[PDB]
Design a protein around this ligand. Structure first.
Ligand code: CHL
Ligand code: CLA
Ligand code: CLA
Ligand code: CLA
Ligand code: CLA
Ligand code: CLA
Ligand code: CLA
Ligand code: CLA
Ligand SMILES: CC1=C(/C=C/C(C)=C/C=C/C(C)=C/C=C/C=C(C)/C=C/C=C(C)/C=C/C2=C(C)CCCC2(C)C)C(C)(C)CCC1
Ligand SMILES: CC1=C(/C=C/C(C)=C/C=C/C(C)=C\C=C\C=C(C)/C=C/C=C(C)/C=C/C2=C(C)CCCC2(C)C)C(C)(C)CCC1
Ligand SMILES: CC1=C(C/C=C(\C)CCC[C@H](C)CCC[C@H](C)CCCC(C)C)C(=O)c2ccccc2C1=O
Lengths: 35, 222, 105, 187, 47, 734
């Protein structure tokens, strides 16, 4: 239903810091992978 | 991954051969596609479950003998200052966990102090640790239930059981403030075996492994 | 106003009569150069499930028990046209009896 | 040899007639895959069984005189609330459906729990299968009719049957479709 | 020479180090906001 | 070499350079060039990608619904659709300051919020949504729809469920079904929802799922539909003094042709929209039984194409052989679809502002401006894509032996004449439009503005007089009672249409002067020149006098080198990339015209636009310079107002435009030598040569150079104009 008041205080940090970091780490492993 | 699985009619994963005890094949995301990673995860699960048994039996004893609520028990005035209590807890754990890690590196067991494994009477058997893993998983699910029932109901385990016994039709996890969320969550949990069976029947060949950044299962996909 | 049953029935009966006795000789000669055997005709071989799903079923062309070639597919099409014309006439009459003049004065 | 659409002969080549209750009713050519057509046969049988249970539940609930109308019982008051009913309704019936689907993939027939045949008494006649398929199609038609009684007439099924029996000319589709505001305003 | 050798022993392996850095980053990011902010008068939760 | 990232390209896998990443991303969805793949696999990938694109669309609109319902003022906007601005989404920026938080607290919110310019508030108020719970359940329903579309994309790509190659090639059945089901019964369901919910909600009656099947949409109750007395639905329409939220001045009419706009909200009537969608539904369902399906009746597309060959050799072989050309080439259908959708998007832009379909949308000036600008830019981009994919069709899949002597072979035969005539009309339009604009600017500079050339747009003014506008005078149709067009339907929609078209406040057929005619002719110049570039690229795609074998080099190749005088930007891709610049200029012109004319209309100083759009200095000063005062004052050393973000993204757009120039002016060689020197510097230093690159750094390719410069150019263009438009329309209006 209605998200809590700390939801903007929590969800934006993941998708702004650690979700791009995890995606960039996975993609960087994907580019340089050999067979 | 054993004949008894997480849902009936399931197929075990390729990396889960059932060699490890306590296996039920409940690996939807496949975070354990490595022998060292799964032995470390097995040790970690055993720790988070053994301390769960200790916490569950302690909380049950405190509720039985009349001690106050556990999640509010940290604010009461106790002997010895909390700062020096924290620093001596850190001091004793910096030796205990160090010895545990060194013993796991040299033996692999969940030993204590200097005796690795700490088995003086000698009750060690695979069935004993299988029951230990099962009871630890049950105790930590019970601890999650204790934390959940202490946040939206404000009552302990015995009071939660009393409220369930008073009127089970309207006093449950599906009638509280998280009741509709619990209904959606359990509908999703009932719909998972109808999706995964459909993909397993559809996926007669290939691999169809889930692709996640943590595991290297996508290496063989491309 | 015009009563709905008489108008609808007359329109669909006239359209079906035009389909059977009038436009049927003009039918099967506009489809002669449309789906004929001399031209490409069929569009699918019918190998797998989708290819034979493209293939016509055995229901629309099995036989014609009518003396003409008026199958039930043509019956449905001409009846739909008759219902359309009858509802058009009923709609025009309904607009007429409401006191509204849509024609240029 | 087969009922077909009508006594006129419409023989299809894809449906020879070996299926239970096979009148060859494929005007749009739905069943030609020869692999998912067995799945459609199982779907027709299971939908017929569910329609059987639905129509017999509606008839029994109206005959025994429940207070709520047959499609109005969802919002009715019960000892167990609706929020306490959806969890077990999903869980145990999902377990049953998963076991039934696994049995269908293993053998090719339906089944309640584990065992494929589910025949404590037997009676597995081909005539019984044909009767099951035809009674299931009739139950499907009956459930569609019941939903249409709820939609157009907004009345109970046997109540609508009594209305049609008492006044055949005045309680038909023409009256119930030309008097919709009267039906909305309490019949 | 004993120090700074077994300190990294449980984190030397790639999987352990990646899990530790991911767990620490996620914990610090989740602590930010409801616990990291609103204590150092950060001008986003005041209004 | 042989890296795993370009799994769809073995040649790109054995590329020991950074370009392998770039070409691994740009060629991601070009399945026709992927190695070891067939037409059936390509079609299945197309199906899965379409399901994914749909799931993304549904997720985006579900997120819009959720972010309006949560941290929004939809109920407050429902209560007061004039005063309180809509809220798009909340702002949680830890880099914000206290004045930034205080300045962004608008619309009665508890924190920093963004004022919505999308128009979802007006749309959802018009269609009947009133509460936040309805938006919540709509968002979760659309999330579930995206989930089942993900299920469809996964399932239809699975083995034993992949459709056959001929299944997609069933053109007649696809046309029949998407005409009957995707268009017809979908519109029928939409007008049913309109009649059931939106008209009662616009008449103060709440119709939800709980009270559904118990509230009659019409007091007669479906018996006029059976009896054919359909005029009973158009019996009691809403009066002029009718409140949209309440039942005051209401009526009982679900379908009518009450032309014009609702006087209270300056929007189209709900019953008019319901009748429109119902008529569209029945017409589409009727048209959806044309083509030959598995039944014995219908039309064959190939036979229609064969038959429509004009006699006496007017079109040569006619339209013969075109059915296989369209069916075999995906790029032909892609170009046709993108062209039609771009034309429809341009129609939507040109008809939404003049005919506002949503309640309280005409009063929201910033919303209408942003919607028009977005729709026109999307339309221009996808028309450019249509022509580009037509060039791709001409290069990749076009067999002259198949369609020999047909219309395609004929337009390839006289392509020089078409290109030359388009160049002539573009040169004529540009030469004389610039001559008149410079003449007017010089005349106004000399202090005697009456010497300027002002040609009155008598053609469009006569058209508008023929459609009801009596301000220009004349005695044409829809303006004199003796005309047959006026007498026909004089009690049907003219009493509303003439009232809406004779008012100067709304945007329905605004008064046009000589400056309007000049800017329309400039728009025609932009359209003709962009068309000339695109058809020069498409017609000379497979060959030219400089490059006869352009089909053998593919669609996107850099050049042929300095031989034969120089051959840079000779591919059809480069013609598309120049036409993107020209399309951006054209849409900039149309949006400048729309923005200035509407700003002067909203301010009431239409004479300022009439006497100032004649000369380009008026465009630069009274539009670009006068309306930018509030934009650039968003943040300054004095303080900050609510338009600080718009100033920041305005400077952002100017900077990305500048970076587009960075990638566009210089081409390759300087960067290759600079990267070589940087490679030597990194290799010949201590403490940093230990870490080495796995892929060799190289300069970006010339095609990649054009792509990156075009992307930065377009991003800067869009961001700059969006910033200026929204800031100017919101700093002085609400
Ligand atoms: C199996 C299919 C099934 C069907 C055909 C319906 C459909 C319907 N039910 Mg029932 N229900 C069904 C089972 C279920 N419903 C409910 C419980 C409810 C509720 C909560 C309500 C009904 C009612 C309704 C209506 C829904 C609202 C509306 O305006 O219509 C679209 C409609 C007659 C409504 C009713 O009875 O109105 C008086 C109502 O309030 N349904 C549950 C939850 C256990 C079901 C799940 O299996
Ligand atoms: C605002 C800047 C600008 C201007 C004025 C032009 C003008 C022109 N371009 Mg260009 N273009 C530009 C920017 C510009 N371009 C940019 C940035 C791009 C993206 C790379 C393109 C991409 C592009 C393509 C892809 C094509 C053109 C074409 C054209 C012609 C269009 C025909 C026309 O409108 O009549 C001409 C109108 C004009 C205003 C031309 C300027 C002539 C004026 C009147 C001065 C004449 C001389 C004057 C008497 C002074 C004499 C003395 C002086 C020489 C010292 C024209 C020469 C097309 C072409 O060649 O046409 C066939 C074509 O194919 N351009
Ligand atoms: C938090 C501690 C923890 C850890 C480390 C694991 C990790 C593991 N368990 Mg466990 N488990 C957990 C919590 C945990 N689970 C909980 C909360 C339950 C009850 C719902 C279970 C019930 C359970 C069963 C019944 C079984 C597993 C199994 C597994 C393996 C597959 C699942 C997986 O990779 O998920 C990774 C999860 C985390 C890292 C967390 C894996 C080695 C299966 C196994 O032994 O396969 C080898 C098996 O049969 N677990
Ligand atoms: C296997 C562990 C376990 C056990 C024995 C129980 C048993 C109980 N819990 Mg519980 N709970 C569990 C897991 C468990 N739950 C989990 C996984 C969650 C979600 C994180 C909850 C969340 C929860 C809440 C919020 C509440 C209960 C309550 C209750 C009581 C009512 C019965 C009920 O809701 O069924 C539990 C549902 C299951 C699916 C099991 C009952 C004593 C209620 C109470 O205090 O008594 C009325 C109450 O307020 N539990
Ligand atoms: C398709 C199967 C189906 C479904 C979904 C329902 C559903 C319902 N019936 Mg019905 N019922 C069915 C078949 C079905 N019935 C059949 C085959 C019969 C025998 C003819 C009945 C006889 C019956 C009676 C006599 C009553 C219901 C009632 C009910 C309600 C609650 C029953 C319940 O779970 O109590 C809990 C049952 C447990 C065993 C626990 C619910 C609306 C009750 C009601 O309130 O109706 C409005 C009621 O009085 N049903
Ligand atoms: C119905 C829509 C549609 C469809 C299905 C296609 C499909 C296709 N087109 Mg077409 N195209 C379209 C619309 C469409 N396009 C439009 C609207 C345009 C005009 C812009 C083009 C212009 C175009 C050209 C010029 C070419 C294609 C090509 C292709 C193929 C390659 C796509 C691929 O897999 O690579 C995936 C491609 C990418 C991932 C590149 C996307 C990069 C974009 C521009 C970045 C986004 C901009 C920006 C940075 C976003 C951030 C904003 C910032 C503010 C944060 C494929 C057949 C190519 C082809 O057939 O090869 C010969 C080709 O040369 N198309
Ligand atoms: C009647 C049955 C039927 C229906 C309903 C559909 C429906 C669909 N199919 Mg089709 N299809 C059918 C039968 C059918 N199919 C058959 C029989 C075949 C085999 C011969 C196919 C073969 C087929 C293929 C091969 C593909 C589809 C695809 C699609 C999708 C098209 C994109 C879309 O969502 O439209 C969106 C567009 C509209 C609803 C209308 C167009 C917009 C115009 C301009 C009108 C705008 C209306 C209005 C002004 C704007 C309203 C919104 C605004 C207010 C915000 C859609 C889900 C495609 C797909 O996978 O999904 C993308 C695809 O690639 N179909
Ligand atoms: C150092 C100088 C400089 C430079 C290089 C730029 C660069 C830019 N500005 Mg900025 N600007 C600057 C200073 C500068 N600015 C200053 C100091 C201000 C005042 C604060 C502005 C105010 C400003 C506004 C208000 C806008 C820009 C826009 C733009 C972009 C131009 C897009 C384009 O190519 O349009 C190509 C050119 C046109 C489309 C038309 C040019 C303007 C004419 C005079 C309007 C009349 C055209 C009309 C249709 C008739 C002409 C037809 C023809 C046949 C004769 C680009 C990012 C615009 C933007 O972001 O993109 C649209 C925009 O809206 N700037
Ligand atoms: C290159 C190429 C291509 C492409 C193309 C394109 C892209 C095109 C476009 C085109 C277009 C884009 C067109 C358009 C057109 C339009 C039109 C044709 C219109 C018309 C109109 C009308 C006719 C109207 C009328 C009217 C009305 C109805 C109302 C009012 C009045 C009037 C009378 C005016 C392709 C792919 C094919 C391939 C080949 C090559
Ligand atoms: C049995 C038989 C017979 C008879 C027959 C008949 C007599 C018939 C009739 C018929 C008729 C007499 C009719 C039909 C019809 C059909 C159809 C198929 C229809 C359709 C319709 C539709 C489709 C509609 C639509 C619509 C709607 C829905 C709404 C709106 C409007 C419209 C109109 C659009 C005979 C003896 C000869 C022979 C033997 C057999
Ligand atoms: C400056 C410049 C460079 C230097 C640019 C380089 C070396 C490319 C790398 C630039 C940075 C490192 C890109 C950073 C990442 C981007 C955001 C894009 C990659 C990530 C997205 C795909 C998500 C060129 O190579 C070049 C080539 C051709 C014409 C003009 C120029 C040019 O102007």
């Amino acid at each position: 239903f209605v998200p809590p008041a700390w939801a903007p205080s929590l969800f934006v940090p993941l998708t702004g810091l650690v979700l791009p970091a995890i995606g960039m780490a996975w993609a960087f492993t994907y580019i340089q992978k050999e067979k | 991954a054993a004949r008894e699985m997480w849902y009936p009619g399931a197929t075990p994963p390729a990396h889960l051969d059932g060699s490890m005890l306590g296996d039920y094949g409940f690996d939807p995301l496949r975070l354990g596609t490595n022998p060292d990673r799964m032995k470390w995860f097995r040790e970690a699960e055993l720790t988070n479950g053994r301390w769960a048994m200790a916490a569950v039996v302690g909380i049950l004893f405190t509720d039985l003998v009349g001690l106050p609520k556990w999640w509010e028990a940290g604010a009461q005035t106790y002997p010895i200052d909390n700062q020096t209590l924290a620093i001596i807890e850190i001091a004793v754990f910096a030796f205990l966990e160090a010895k545990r890690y060194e013993g796991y590196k040299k033996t692999g067991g969940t030993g204590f102090a200097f005796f690795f494994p700490f088995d003086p009477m000698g009750m060690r058997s695979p069935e004993k640790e299988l029951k230990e893993l099962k009871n630890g998983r049950l105790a930590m699910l019970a601890f999650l239930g204790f934390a959940s029932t202490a946040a939206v109901n404000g009552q302990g385990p015995i009071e939660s059981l009393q409220t369930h016994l008073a009127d089970p039709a309207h006093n449950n996890i599906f009638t509280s403030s998280v009741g509709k969320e619990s209904c959606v969550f359990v509908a999703v949990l009932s719909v998972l075996p109808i999706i995964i069976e459909a993909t397993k029947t559809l996926g007669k060949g290939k691999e169809s492994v889930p692709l996640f950044p943590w595991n290297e299962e996508w290496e063989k996909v491309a | 106003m015009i009563e709905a049953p008489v108008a609808i029935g007359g329109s669909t009966v006239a359209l079906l009569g035009l389909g059977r006795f009038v436009f049927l000789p003009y039918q099967r000669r506009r489809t002669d150069m449309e789906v004929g055997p001399g031209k490409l005709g069929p569009k699918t071989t019918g190998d797998t499930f989708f290819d034979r799903l493209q293939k016509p079923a055995s229901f629309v062309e099995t036989k014609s028990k009518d003396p003409s070639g008026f199958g039930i597919i043509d019956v449905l099409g001409w009846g739909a046209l008759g219902h359309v014309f009858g509802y058009f006439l009923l709609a025009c009459s309904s607009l007429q009896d409401a006191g509204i003049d849509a024609f240029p004065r | 040899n087969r009922p077909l659409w009508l006594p006129d002969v419409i023989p299809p080549p894809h449906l020879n007639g070996t299926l239970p209750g096979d009148s060859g009713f494929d005007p749009l050519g739905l069943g030609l895959n020869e692999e998912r057509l067995k799945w459609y046969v199982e779907a027709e049988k299971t939908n017929g069984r569910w329609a059987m249970m639905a129509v017999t539940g509606i008839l029994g609930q109206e005959l025994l005189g429940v207070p709520a109308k047959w499609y109005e019982a969802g919002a009715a008051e019960y000892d167990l609330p609706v929020q306490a009913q959806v969890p077990i309704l999903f869980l145990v019936m999902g377990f049953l459906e998963t076991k039934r689907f696994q049995g269908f993939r293993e053998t090719g027939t339906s089944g309640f729990i584990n065992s494929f045949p589910f025949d404590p008494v037997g009676l597995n006649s081909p005539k019984h299968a044909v009767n099951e398929v035809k009674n299931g199609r009739l139950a499907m038609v009956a459930f569609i009719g019941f939903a249409m009684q709820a939609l157009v007439s907004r009345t109970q099924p046997i109540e609508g049957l009594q209305k049609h029996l008492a006044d055949p000319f005045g309680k038909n589709i023409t009256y119930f479709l030309t008097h919709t505001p009267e039906v909305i305003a309490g019949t | 020479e004993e120090f700074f050798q077994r300190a990294t022993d449980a984190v030397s392996r790639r999987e352990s180090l990646n899990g530790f850095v991911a767990l620490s980053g996620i914990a610090a990011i989740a602590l930010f906001g409801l616990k990291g902010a609103s204590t150092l008068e950060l001008p986003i939760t005041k209004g | 070499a042989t890296k795993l990232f370009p799994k769809f390209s073995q040649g790109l896998a054995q590329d020991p350079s950074t370009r392998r990443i770039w070409y691994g991303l740009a060629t991601a969805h070009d399945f026709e060039s992927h190695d070891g793949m067939t037409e059936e696999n390509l079609y299945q990938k197309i199906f899965a990608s379409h399901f994914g694109q749909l799931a993304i669309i549904f997720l985006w609109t579900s997120g819009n619904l959720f972010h309006v319902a949560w941290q929004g003022n939809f109920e407050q906007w429902v209560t007061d659709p004039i005063h309180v601005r809509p809220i798009a989404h909340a702002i949680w920026d830890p880099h914000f300051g206290q004045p930034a938080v205080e300045a962004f607290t608008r619309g009665g919110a508890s924190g920093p919020v963004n004022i919505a310019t999308s128009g979802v508030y007006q749309w959802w108020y018009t269609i009947g949504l009133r509460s936040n719970q309805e938006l919540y359940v709509s968002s979760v329903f659309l999330a579930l729809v995206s989930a089942v579309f993900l299920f469809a994309g996964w399932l239809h790509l699975q083995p034993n469920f992949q459709p056959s190659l001929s299944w997609f090639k069933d053109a007649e059945s696809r046309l029949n079904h998407h005409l009957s089901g995707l268009f017809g019964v979908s519109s029928l369901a939409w007008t049913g929802h309109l009649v059931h919910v939106a008209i009662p909600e616009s008449r103060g009656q709440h119709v939800g799922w709980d009270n559904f099947l118990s509230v009659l949409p019409h007091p007669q109750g479906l018996t006029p539909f059976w009896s054919g007395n359909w005029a009973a639905y158009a019996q009691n329409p809403d009066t002029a003094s009718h409140a949209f939220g309440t039942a005051d001045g209401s009526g009982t009419a679900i379908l009518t042709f009450l032309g014009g706009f609702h006087p209270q909200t300056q929007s189209l009537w709900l019953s008019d929209m319901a009748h429109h969608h119902l008529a569209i539904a029945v017409l589409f369902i009727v048209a959806g039984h044309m083509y030959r399906t598995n039944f014995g009746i219908g039309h064959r597309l190939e036979a229609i194409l064969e038959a429509h060959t004009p006699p006496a050799g007017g079109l040569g072989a006619g339209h013969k052989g075109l059915f296989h050309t369209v069916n075999n080439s995906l790029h032909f259908q892609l170009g046709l679809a993108l062209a039609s959708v771009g034309t429809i998007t341009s129609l939507v832009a040109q008809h939404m502002y003049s005919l506002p379909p949503y309640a309280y949308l005409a009063v929201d000036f910033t919303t209408q401006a942003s919607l028009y600008t977005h729709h026109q830019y999307i339309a221009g981009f996808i028309m450019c894509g249509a022509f580009a994919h037509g060039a791709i069709f001409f290069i990749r899949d076009y067999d002259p032996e198949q369609n020999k002597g047909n219309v395609l072979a004929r337009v390839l035969d006289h392509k020089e004449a078409i290109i030359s005539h388009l160049s002539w009309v573009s040169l004529f339009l540009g030469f004389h439009t610039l001559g008149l604009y410079v003449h007017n600017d010089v005349v106004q500079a000399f202090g005697t503005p009456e010497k300027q050339i002002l040609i009155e747009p008598v053609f469009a003014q006569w058209i508008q007089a023929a459609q009801g506008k009596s301000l220009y005078g004349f005695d044409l149709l829809l303006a004199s009672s003796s005309s047959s067009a006026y007498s026909a339907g004089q009690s049907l929609w003219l009493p509303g249409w003439l009232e809406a078209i004779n008012n100067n406040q709304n945007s329905l057929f605004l008064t046009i002067g000589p400056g309007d005619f000049l800017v329309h002719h400039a728009i025609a110049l932009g359209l003709h020149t962009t068309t000339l570039i695109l058809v020069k690229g498409a017609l000379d795609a497979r060959g030219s006098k400089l490059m006869p074998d352009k089909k053998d080099f593919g669609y996107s190749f850099p050049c042929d080198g300095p031989g034969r005088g120089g051959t840079c930007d000779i591919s059809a891709y480069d013609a598309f990339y120049l036409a993107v610049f020209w399309m951006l200029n054209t849409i900039g012109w149309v949006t400048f015209y729309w923005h200035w004319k509407h700003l002067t209309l909203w301010q009431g100083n239409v004479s300022q636009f009439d006497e100032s759009s004649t000369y380009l200095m008026g465009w630069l000063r009274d539009y670009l310079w006068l309306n930018s005062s509030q934009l650039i004052n968003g943040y300054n050393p004095f303080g900050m107002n609510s338009l600080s973000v718009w100033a920041w993204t305005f400077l952002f757009g100017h900077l990305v435009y500048a970076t587009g120039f960075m990638f566009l002016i210089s081409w390759r060689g300087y960067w290759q030598e600079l990267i070589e020197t940087l490679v030597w510097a990194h290799e010949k230093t201590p403490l940093a040569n230990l870490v080495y690159w796995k892929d060799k750094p190289v300069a970006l390719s010339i095609v990649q150079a054009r792509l990156v410069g075009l992307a930065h150019f377009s991003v800067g263009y869009i961001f700059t104009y969006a910033a200026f438009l929204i800031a100017s329309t919101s700093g002085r209006f609400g």
